[PDB]
Amino acid sequence: KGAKPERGRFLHFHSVTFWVGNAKQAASFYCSKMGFEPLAYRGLETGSREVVSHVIKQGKIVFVLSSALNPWNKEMGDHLVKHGDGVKDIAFEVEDCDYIVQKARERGAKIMREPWVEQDKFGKVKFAVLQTYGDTTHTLVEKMNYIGQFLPGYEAPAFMDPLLPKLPKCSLEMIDHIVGNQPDQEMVSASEWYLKNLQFHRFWSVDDTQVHTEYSSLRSIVVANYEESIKMPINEPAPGKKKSQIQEYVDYNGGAGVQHIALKTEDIITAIRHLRERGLEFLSVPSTYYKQLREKLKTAKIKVKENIDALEELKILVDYDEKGYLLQIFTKPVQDRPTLFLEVIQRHNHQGFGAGNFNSLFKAFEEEQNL
Amino acid sequence: KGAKPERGRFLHFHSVTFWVGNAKQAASFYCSKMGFEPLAYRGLETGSREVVSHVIKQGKIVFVLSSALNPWNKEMGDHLVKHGDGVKDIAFEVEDCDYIVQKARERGAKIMREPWVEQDKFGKVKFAVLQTYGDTTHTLVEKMNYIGQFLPGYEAPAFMDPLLPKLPKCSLEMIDHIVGNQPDQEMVSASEWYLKNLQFHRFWSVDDTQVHTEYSSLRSIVVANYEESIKMPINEPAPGKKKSQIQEYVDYNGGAGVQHIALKTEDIITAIRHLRERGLEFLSVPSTYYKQLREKLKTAKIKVKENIDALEELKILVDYDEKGYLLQIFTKPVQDRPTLFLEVIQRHNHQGFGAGNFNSLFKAFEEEQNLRG
Numbered sequence: 202k203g204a205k206p207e208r209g210r211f212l213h214f215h216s217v218t219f220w221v222g223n224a225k226q227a228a229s230f231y232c233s234k235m236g237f238e239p240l241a242y243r244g245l246e247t248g249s250r251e252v253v254s255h256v257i258k259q260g261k262i263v264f265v266l267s268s269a270l271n272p273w274n275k276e277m278g279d280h281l282v283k284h285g286d287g288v289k290d291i292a293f294e295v296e297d298c299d300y301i302v303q304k305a306r307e308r309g310a311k312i313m314r315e316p317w318v319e320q321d322k323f324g325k326v327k328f329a330v331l332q333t334y335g336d337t338t339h340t341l342v343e344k345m346n347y348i349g350q351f352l353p354g355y356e357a358p359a360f361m362d363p364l365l366p367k368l369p370k371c372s373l374e375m376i377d378h379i380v381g382n383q384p385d386q387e388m389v390s391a392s393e394w395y396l397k398n399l400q401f402h403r404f405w406s407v408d409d410t411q412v413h414t415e416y417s418s419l420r421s422i423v424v425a426n427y428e429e430s431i432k433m434p435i436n437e438p439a440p441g442k443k444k445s446q447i448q449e450y451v452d453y454n455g456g457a458g459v460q461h462i463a464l465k466t467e468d469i470i471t472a473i474r475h476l477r478e479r480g481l482e483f484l485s486v487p488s489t490y491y492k493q494l495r496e497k498l499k500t501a502k503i504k505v506k507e508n509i510d511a512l513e514e515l516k517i518l519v520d521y522d523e524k525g526y527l528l529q530i531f532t533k534p535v536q537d538r539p540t541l542f543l544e545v546i547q548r549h550n551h552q553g554f555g556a557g558n559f560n561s562l563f564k565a566f567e568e569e570q571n572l
Numbered sequence: 573k574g575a576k577p578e579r580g581r582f583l584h585f586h587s588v589t590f591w592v593g594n595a596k597q598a599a600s601f602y603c604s605k606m607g608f609e610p611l612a613y614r615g616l617e618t619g620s621r622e623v624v625s626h627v628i629k630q631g632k633i634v635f636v637l638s639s640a641l642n643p644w645n646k647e648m649g650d651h652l653v654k655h656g657d658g659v660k661d662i663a664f665e666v667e668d669c670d671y672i673v674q675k676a677r678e679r680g681a682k683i684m685r686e687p688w689v690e691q692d693k694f695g696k697v698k699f700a701v702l703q704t705y706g707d708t709t710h711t712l713v714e715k716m717n718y719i720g721q722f723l724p725g726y727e728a729p730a731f732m733d734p735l736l737p738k739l740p741k742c743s744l745e746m747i748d749h750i751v752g753n754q755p756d757q758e759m760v761s762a763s764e765w766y767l768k769n770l771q772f773h774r775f776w777s778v779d780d781t782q783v784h785t786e787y788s789s790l791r792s793i794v795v796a797n798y799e800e801s802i803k804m805p806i807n808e809p810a811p812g813k814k815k816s817q818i819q820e821y822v823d824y825n826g827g828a829g830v831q832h833i834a835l836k837t838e839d840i841i842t843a844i845r846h847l848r849e850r851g852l853e854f855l856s857v858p859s860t861y862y863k864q865l866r867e868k869l870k871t872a873k874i875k876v877k878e879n880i881d882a883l884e885e886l887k888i889l890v891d892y893d894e895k896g897y898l899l900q901i902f903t904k905p906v907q908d909r910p911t912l913f914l915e916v917i918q919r920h921n922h923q924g925f926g927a928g929n930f931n932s933l934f935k936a937f938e939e940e941q942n943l944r945g
C-alpha cells in the first residue's frame with residue numbers, strides 16, 4: 202500500500218555486517234549459539250591484508266563479522282571504543298543500483314562510496330555505500346550475472362568447526378526487521394531519511410492504533426521498502442513508567458545504532474528449544490505472565506495454535522489482536538553493554554511487533570512483586 | 573642453580589587476564605573450545621560499573637576476560653586498537669607481597685599500583701601491579717586468611733551455560749609456561765627485568781646447549797622464579813631460513829606482548845581428541861613428520877608409551893632428549909591477527925620446550941614439498 206517508485210527495487214536484506222573486536226571468536230559465537238554456518242571468508246589468506254571478515258549463514262540470514270588486521274586503524278579502532286561490538290552496516294540487495302544512488306543524492310543523502318563493480322570467476326557485482334544514523338551505513342548490492350556462493354573476493358571458510366554438525370538446527374529462515382535507536386528528536390530525522398532519499402514509506406500496524414508509551418518508554422516509526430519485505434523501525438526515548446531502554450541504549454552506544462535484529466521462524470518451539478540447547482540465554486519471564494495469559498485467552502477472539510504449556514516452558518512471549526497473533530522472544534544482550542540483542546519472531550496472521558507486550562510484561566512483573 | 577632470596581616468594585601462576593572486546597563471547601569461546609568452566613563474575617549485576625570480567629577455570633588455570641562497560645575507555649580502548657584481543661596481565665600468587673614490592677622498586681621496577689587490601693565476607697586479599705614488557709602487567713595475590721571461591725568483589729557467574737556440562741573434558745590442569753615476544757635487541761632487557769627486580773634466575777634446559785636459531789628464527793632466554801614453579805621464556809627475533817615468527821608478532825601486536833600460553837596435561841591424547849571434537853583448531857602437520865619421527869626413534873635411547881598412529885592423527889608433535897621426551901601441539905591463533913596462540917604440552921622426564929621441533933617441522937615440510945612433484 203503506497204505508490205510504486207519510477208525505477209529501481211529494494212529486494213530484501215542482503216547481510217548485516219558486525220564490526221567486532223575479534224571476528225574469529227565472534228563468528229564462533231553466532232554459529233555455536235544461534236545456529237549459523239560458515240559460508241565465506243576473506244582475510245590474510247585470500248588477499249585482504251587490512252580487514253578480515255567471517256561470513257556465516259542460516260537460511261537467508263547472512264551475518265558477516267569484521268575486524269581490523271593492522272594496528273592503529275582509525276575508523277575500525279574508533280568504532281570499537283565508542284560502541285564495542287555491534288552492527289556497522291545493513292546491506293540491501295537492489296535492482297538498478299545506479300538509479301537508487303542517483304535518487305538519494307538528488308534529495309540529500311551523502312554517498313560514502315558511489316557505484317563500483319567487482320568481478321571474479323562467477324560474474325560481477327555492483328556495490329554502493331550510503332550512510333544513515335549514527336555510524337551505521339547502507340551498502341547496496343546489485344548482482345550482474347553472478348552465481349557465486351556469496352560475493353566476489355571471498356573464498357571458502359578458513360576452518361570448518363566439526364562441532365556445528367552435531368548441533369540441532371534452529372529453524373531461523375529470514376530477517377524480519379531491524380531496529381535503530383536514536384537520541385531524542387532524531388526519530389523523525391532518522392526515519393524520514395529513508396522516506397526522502399530511498400523512497401521508502403511509513404509502515405502502519407496494530408502497534409500504532411494505541412498508545413503504549415507509558416509501558417514501552419519509546420516512540421516508534423517503522424519504515425519499509427515498497428514491496429514491504431524490508432521492514433525497519435526507528436525508535437526514540439519517551440516518558441514511561443520505567444527507565445527507557447532507548448535512552449540507556451544511546452548512553453552505552455555513544456550515539457544511534459542498531460538495537461536488535463529480528464530473525465523469523467516457522468517453528469518457534471523448535472527454534473527456542475534448540476537455541477537453549479546450544480547455550481543461548483534469553484530474558485527471564487515470571488510465571489505471572491502465563492497465568493495472566495491464559496486468563497486473557499478465554500475472552501480472546503483468536504486462539505493460540507501452539508501448546509501454551511511449552512511457551513511457559515520456553516519463556517516465549519505472546520501478543521495478539523482481533524485477527525491474528527505473534528510469538529516473540531528476546532535474548533540477553535549479545536555483548537556486555539546494554540546495547541544490542543536479538544529477537545526470534547513467528548507471525549500468525551499478525552503484522553505487529555508486540556507493542557502490547559510492554560504492558561503485558563509490566564503487569565506480569567507487577568503482580569509478581571506484589572505477591 | 574640459584575641463590576635463595578632472604579624473604580618473599582612466588583608460589584605459582586595465579587591467573588591470566590585477557591583484555592578482550594567482548595568478554596561475554598570471549599569467555600564463551602574458551603569454555604566451548606578449550607574445556608574451561610565459569611567460576612566468578614563481576615559487572616553491572618555485582619556493582620562493578622565500568623569493567624566487566626568473566627572468570628573461567630580449568631584445573632588450576634583461570635582465565636579472566638575483561639571489557640570496558642561504558643564508552644571512551646582510553647586504557648582498554650587503545651589496548652584493543654593496538655593489540656587486538658590479547659593478554660594484559662599474568663598474575664602470581666605470592667607470599668610477603670609488601671617486601672616483594674619495595675625490592676622491585678629499589679632495583680628500578682615501575683609500580684603501577686602500590687599494594688592495597690580488598691575485603692570480603694570470606695577474608696582479605698592483597699594486590700599490587702607492576703609494569704613489564706609492553707603493556708603487559710603483573711599482579712600479585714597474597715591471601716590473608718581468605719577462603720573465598722575466587723577473589724573479593726566477585727560473585728557467581730552471570731549465566732551458567734547448559735551445553736558445557738555435556739561436552740568432553742579436556743584434561744588441562746595448570747599453566748606450564750607463558751612466552752612474551754620482544755622487538756630486536758630487547759630480549760636480554762626483558763629477561764633482565766625479572767632477574768634484577770624480582771630476584772629471578774635463568775632457567776637452563778637441554779634446548780640451551782644447541783644452536784637452533786637457523787630453524788627457530790628466534791633467540792630465547794627462559795626466566796624463572798627460584799622454586800621454578802613459573803617459567804616464562806623471553807624472545808626476540810633472530811635471522812633464520814624463514815621470516816621470524818617473533819617479528820610478525822611484534823609487527824601485528826604493535827610491540828612486545830605475550831605470544832602463547834602453555835597448558836600442561838597428563839593425557840595429551842584425550843585432551844587433543846576432545847578439544848578437536850569441541851572445535852578447537854590446531855596447526856597443520858604433514859604426514860612426513862611422522863614418517864621421519866618413526867625412523868629417528870629407531871636410533872634413540874628412549875621409547876614413547878603413546879601410540880604414534882594416535883599422534884599422526886591428532887597432529888601432536890614430539891621432541892625428545894637423551895633420557896626423556898615431551899609431547900606438544902600448538903593451536904591456530906585465537907584471533908585473525910597472527911599474534912596469540914596456545915600450546916598443550918605433556919612432559920616425560922623432559923624439562924625442555926621443544927626447540928628442536930623447529931628443525932623437525934622444517935625437515936617434514938621440506939620432504940612434503942620435495943616429493944609432492
Ligand SMILES: CCN1c2ccc(C(=O)c3cnn(C)c3O)cc2N(CC)S1(=O)=O
Binds near residue numbers: 544556558
Ligand atoms: C515484553 C516487553 N518487551 C518488548 C516488547 C516488544 C519488543 C519489540 O520487538 C518491538 C517493539 N516495537 N518494535 C518496533 C519492536 O521491534 C521488544 C521488547 N523488549 C526489549 C528487550 S521488552 O522485553 O522490554
Ligand SMILES: CCN1c2ccc(C(=O)c3cnn(C)c3O)cc2N(CC)S1(=O)=O
Binds near residue numbers: 855913915933
Ligand atoms: C613445531 C615447530 N614450532 C615450534 C616448536 C616449539 C615451540 C615452543 O614451544 C618454544 C620454543 N622455544 N620456546 C621458548 C618455546 O616456548 C613453538 C613452536 N612454533 C610456534 C607455533 S612452531 O610451529 O614454529
Ligand SMILES: [Co+2]
Binds near residue numbers: 463544554
Ligand atoms: Co522487535
Ligand SMILES: [Co+2]
Binds near residue numbers: 749
Ligand atoms: Co612454548
